[PDB]
């Protein structure tokens, strides 16, 4: 996260770290959506241009974390993966369309002050909150600058951007399964996701029921925190029928 700040303890209790078993290293962010299911970006698990194609046994998830590098004894919980599910129409060839994946845990995780699931949006919450200018929150342990790495989880609040502005900022083809966020050059404030924040959640707090909803997944951007560029997020609601199908079937 570029130009963010240290998270408060328990501020994002749904934040998950995807961790490579060997060598031991951070791979991506992710989010807890129930006691057995974790949501992430497909490109965290499968990206052939970079020779990335992880299997379940390659990975662990670490839940309840604050420190990036410490083993947070008596606080974090570490889970093995039973199965990975990648969207069948995830487009890794072109533009990361439908950049979404689910991971089922081998055993349910116990909730605590530090471990708690986020909500997924219904149609009405999505329609009401996914509006240009409305701000969400992005969290992660990724790089602090494009060109280093944080001691603890970072957080930044960012406004959703009008779709024509998103489209005019890039040569990559945008789809209805994406939205973009970030400040404009003339707005002064800045901030962005960066490498290592992939797969983490873009959340909004509903003013109707005071619950946090995950509207987006950190997906792609050109650089980090560049003027006139924006970060792109998987549109969770647009893909919720697939999420429901997977969870119901498995």
């Amino acid at each position: 996260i570029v130009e963010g700040s240290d998270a408060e303890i328990g501020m994002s209790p749904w934040q998950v770290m995807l961790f490579r078993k060997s060598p031991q290293e951070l791979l991506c962010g992710a989010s807890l959506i129930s006691d057995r299911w974790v949501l992430t970006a497909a490109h965290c698990l499968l990206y052939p241009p970079w020779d990335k194609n992880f299997t379940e046994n390659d990975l662990l998830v670490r839940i309840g974390k604050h420190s990036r590098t410490r083993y947070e004894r008596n606080i974090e919980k570490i889970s093995m993966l039973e199965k990975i599910y990648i969207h069948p129409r995830y487009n890794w060839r072109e533009n990361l369309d439908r950049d979404i994946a689910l991971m089922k845990l081998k055993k349910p995780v116990a909730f605590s002050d530090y471990i708690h699931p986020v909500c997924l949006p219904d149609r009405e919450t999505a329609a009401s909150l996914l509006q240009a200018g409305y701000k969400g929150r992005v969290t992660g342990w990724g790089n602090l600058k494009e060109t280093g790495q944080p001691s603890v989880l970072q957080v930044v609040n960012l406004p959703i951007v009008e779709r024509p502005v998103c489209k005019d900022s890039t040569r990559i083809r945008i789809t209805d399964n994406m939205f973009c966020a970030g400040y404009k050059p003339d707005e002064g404030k800045r901030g962005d996701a960066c490498e290592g924040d992939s797969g983490g959640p873009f959340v909004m707090k509903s003013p109707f029921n005071n619950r946090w909803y995950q509207m987006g997944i950190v997906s792609w951007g050109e650089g980090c925190d560049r003027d006139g560029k924006y970060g792109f997020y998987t549109h969770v609601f647009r893909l919720k029928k697939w999420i429901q199908k997977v969870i119901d079937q498995f």
């Binding site: 303890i9 708690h116 699931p117 200018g133 409305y134 929150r137 707090k205 946090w212």
Partner: peptide, 28 residues
């Protein structure tokens, strides 16, 4: 879940975090 999106150290105890008000003020 029934209590999804309600944080134990914030919403469940009626405590606000230091920047959530910025989000609310944007929901115009």
């Amino acid at each position: 879940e029934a209590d999804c999106g309600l944080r134990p150290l914030f919403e469940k105890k009626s405590l606000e975090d230091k920047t959530e008000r910025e989000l609310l003020e944007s929901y115009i």
